[PDB]
Write a protein that binds this ligand. Structure first.
Ligand SMILES: [Mg+2]
Ligand SMILES: [Mg+2]
Ligand SMILES: [Mg+2]
Ligand SMILES: [Mg+2]
Ligand SMILES: [Mg+2]
Ligand SMILES: [Mg+2]
Ligand SMILES: [Mg+2]
Ligand SMILES: [Mg+2]
Ligand SMILES: [Mg+2]
Ligand SMILES: [Mg+2]
Ligand SMILES: [Mg+2]
Lengths: 149, 70
RNA sequence: UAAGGUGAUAUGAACCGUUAUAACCGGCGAUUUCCGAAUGGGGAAACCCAGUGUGUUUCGACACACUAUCAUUAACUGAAUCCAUAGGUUAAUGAGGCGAACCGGGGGAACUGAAACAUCUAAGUACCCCGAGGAAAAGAAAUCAACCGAGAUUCCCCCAG
RNA sequence: GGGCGUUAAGUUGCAGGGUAUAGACCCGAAACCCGGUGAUCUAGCCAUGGGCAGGUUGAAGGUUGGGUAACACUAACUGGAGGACCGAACCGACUAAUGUUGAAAAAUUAGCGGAUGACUUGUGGCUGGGGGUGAAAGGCCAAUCAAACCGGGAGAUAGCU
RNA sequence: GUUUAUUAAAAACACAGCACUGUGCAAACACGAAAGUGGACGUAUACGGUGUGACGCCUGCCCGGUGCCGGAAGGUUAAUU
RNA sequence: UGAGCCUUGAUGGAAGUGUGGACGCCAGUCUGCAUGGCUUUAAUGUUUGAUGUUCUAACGUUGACCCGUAAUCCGGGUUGCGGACAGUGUCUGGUGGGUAGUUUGACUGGGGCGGUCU
C-alpha cells in the first residue's frame, strides 16, 4: 500500500504517490519493465532532488518535437497496395509496418511505437486515415491507399 | 518439505478427537514458484506461506542471499 | 643384546654364527601382488577390458604411471540473447571407508502395568538414522528475589515424592 | 457440659518379626508390535526359446462332371471343423490293491482324463506379509499360511498345569 | 456352461438381454515414485463401472421402508463478522 | 442505492400579479425564481457497504518453437491464447457425521440366560 510511479499511467497518482497506494498489483507487472516504485525511506528522499531542484523543455524541447504535424501533411499520396484480391478482399497484412514504413518509400524513417488508431484497420484499399501520435503534447496527420496488380 | 526461505515443518503430532486418538498427523505448508527478481529474472523457488509473506517485509534479494551463501 | 642360531605342529637336510653386524628385542625406514571406500570403465569380490604418457627395447612389446565423484578456489573456454550467466576443461587442495563404549541430535514402539481398558504406564526405553570428540554437552541476566538481598553455565546432596 | 490433650522418655545404631517399592520361586502358551530375509517351491504375469509318433474320424466351404431355363440335388476330389475318437511322447490325477517304523514326509502296480490348445516346457525377469498372487479352495507365497521366515521389544501375560 | 484341488455342483457364479452412470481421445479407468503400458493400433452403433439375469418363450403387481436420481421455493443449520 | 461525518437549507438589496414541491383536524400557510421603480429531515462534498457497467495491469498457460541437451522433468528465450480474471495469503458468512472429542456394573452354588439390586 506504498509506491512511487512518477510516470503516471491511468493510476490515482502522478510524479509518484507519497500516500497509501495499491498492493500485490505491482509485485508482478508495474514494478517489472513498467515503472519501478518502492516508497521505502531510501528510494523516497532520492526523488526530492529530482523535484526540489526544479523547465526550458516546454519552450525548447516541445519545439524540437512539435513540427511533426507540420513536417508530414502535404505528403504525396501513400501508394502501398496491400495485395487487393480474393474476389474483392486482400492478401497483404495491414497493422503496424505498412502504416509507418510508408514514409521510407523515398528515404525518411519513423518509429512503429507512435501510431494512433484504437481499432485494427479493416483490410481495405480506400483512404486509410493515419493520425500520427509522436507525443501527448503534439499530434500529426498521415494517409495510406491500396492498388490492384 | 521445502518453504526454503523459512525452515519447513513435516513434524508429526497426534490428532486427538474426543478424549483420544493415538493416531498421527504431519505434512504441512505448501508451495508455489516463479518469483521475478528485479535483477535478471526469476528462478522458481518453492516457498510457501510464512515464506512468501517473508519475501515481502524483507527483500527478494536478501531473501535469496542465503539460499546461495550457505 | 649375544653365545648361540635358521617361528610351530616333527625331526632331519643343508647351513649362518662365538669379538664387535649370526641370531634375538626396540626405534626410523625400504619393499608391500589381487580384492576391498576401491577411485580409469565394467564385474557373480580376489576377475575382465580401454585411453593416454614412459623407460630397457633384438626397439611389435612388458609391466609401469595417471585418468572415479563431489566441494572450495584459480585460470582458461562459453548457449538460447549484446552483454552476463548456464554449461565445459584443466589444476591444487580436501572429502569418501572402517570404528567397541561414552556423547549431541533427527525419527520412535509394544509386550507391560493400571489385577479389564481408551486417559495414563512401560519410556523418550528398545530400535533405526546423522554427526563429533577424547570426552562430548553445557557455560556472564531483558535471572531470581520481595522492599532484605543474591548474582554466568555446569555437576553433587537437600527442599519433596 | 462434651471431643481431643495435660507429671507416657525419647533418640541413634545393631540383630530379628511384618509391611512398602521393586521380578521377584522356576519352566511354559496361543498371540501383539518393530525392523530385516524370502517368488532356486508355488500363484499369477513379462521377455525370449523348445515340444506335440503319437495314431483316427473326417463337418462347413470350394473345383469339376452331371444335371436345372436358373437354383436346389448329386458324384467324386480338395478342404479342413469338433467342450469329436484312441492314441504314444508330454501334461494331469478318477478308481482299487500295496505301502503306513514305506523304496518314498504323497509313491509303486494295474487301469484313468487332456494330448494344436484357456496346451505344454527351458532360461531369465516382476509382484512381499495385513502385503502379494488367486478360472475362488482361505488356495499358493521354499515339507510353514484365517496372516511367511529371521532377529528384536522379551524373562510379553499366564487368577492355569 | 462355472464353483469350494482333498465332506457343499446347488436355488449359488456365469450367461445372452435390460437399465443407470461415466468417457471428446494424450478418453474415462487401471499398472506404475516416473518413463512408459494396457484401454486400442479401438474413438460414443466405442470403451469402462454399477445393478438386474448359450439358446428358446419370456421376465407380471408394489416407490410405503432403505438406497440412488432430480428439484431446491420455504423451515433448520458450521466456521466466519 | 443505503449509511458516518456533518456542509447549505425548513420547525423544534423595498411593497404588489404568478409559477412550482410541502402537508394537512382545512379551510391554509411554507418556500426558490420575473416584472415592477444539535436533533426529524432533504441536496453537494465526501468515507464506506451493495448490485451492476467498462478498462488493463496482476499473473496463468497440462499450445507452439529455440537453447541449455543426442531430457518426457526444470530453467531461460521467442511466440500465441487468457488477463487484472483466474489463483494464493489474511480475515469473514455459509455448509460441514467427511472426521474428532464428549465406556459397556454387581449379586450369582462357575459364568452366561433368567431374576434382583432402595
Ligand atoms: Mg594403481
Ligand atoms: Mg560409480
Ligand atoms: Mg490395580
Ligand atoms: Mg517394564
Ligand atoms: Mg501393527
Ligand atoms: Mg510338445
Ligand atoms: Mg490345469
Ligand atoms: Mg509287471
Ligand atoms: Mg471360476
Ligand atoms: Mg479365480
Ligand atoms: Mg490352511
Amino acid at each position: 500500500m506504498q509506491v512511487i510511479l512518477l510516470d503516471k499511467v491511468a493510476n490515482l497518482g502522478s510524479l509518484g504517490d507519497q500516500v497509501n497506494v495499491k498492493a500485490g498489483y505491482a509485485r508482478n507487472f508495474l514494478v517489472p519493465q513498467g515503472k519501478a516504485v518502492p516508497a521505502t525511506k531510501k528510494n523516497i528522499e532520492f526523488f526530492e532532488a529530482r523535484r526540489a531542484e526544479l523547465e526550458a523543455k516546454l519552450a525548447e524541447v516541445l519545439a524540437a518535437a512539435n513540427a511533426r504535424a507540420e513536417k508530414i501533411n502535404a505528403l504525396e499520396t501513400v501508394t502501398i497496395a496491400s495485395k487487393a484480391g480474393d474476389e474483392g478482399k486482400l492478401f497483404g497484412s495491414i497493422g503496424t509496418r505498412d502504416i509507418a514504413d510508408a514514409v521510407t518509400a523515398a528515404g525518411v524513417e519513423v518509429a512503429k511505437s507512435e501510431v494512433r488508431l484504437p481499432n485494427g484497420v479493416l483490410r481495405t484499399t480506400g483512404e486509410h486515415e493515419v493520425s500520427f501520435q509522436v507525443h501527448s503534447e503534439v499530434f500529426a496527420k498521415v494517409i495510406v491507399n491500396v492498388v490492384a496488380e | 518439505m521445502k518453504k526454503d526461505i523459512h525452515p519447513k515443518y513435516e513434524e508429526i503430532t497426534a490428532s486427538c478427537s474426543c478424549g483420544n486418538v493415538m493416531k498421527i498427523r504431519s505434512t504441512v505448508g505448501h508451495d508455489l514458484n516463479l518469483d521475478v527478481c528485479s535483477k535478471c529474472h526469476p528462478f522458481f523457488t518453492g516457498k510457501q506461506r510464512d515464506v512468501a509473506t517473508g519475501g515481502r517485509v524483507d527483500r527478494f534479494n536478501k531473501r535469496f542471499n542465503i539460499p546461495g551463501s550457505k
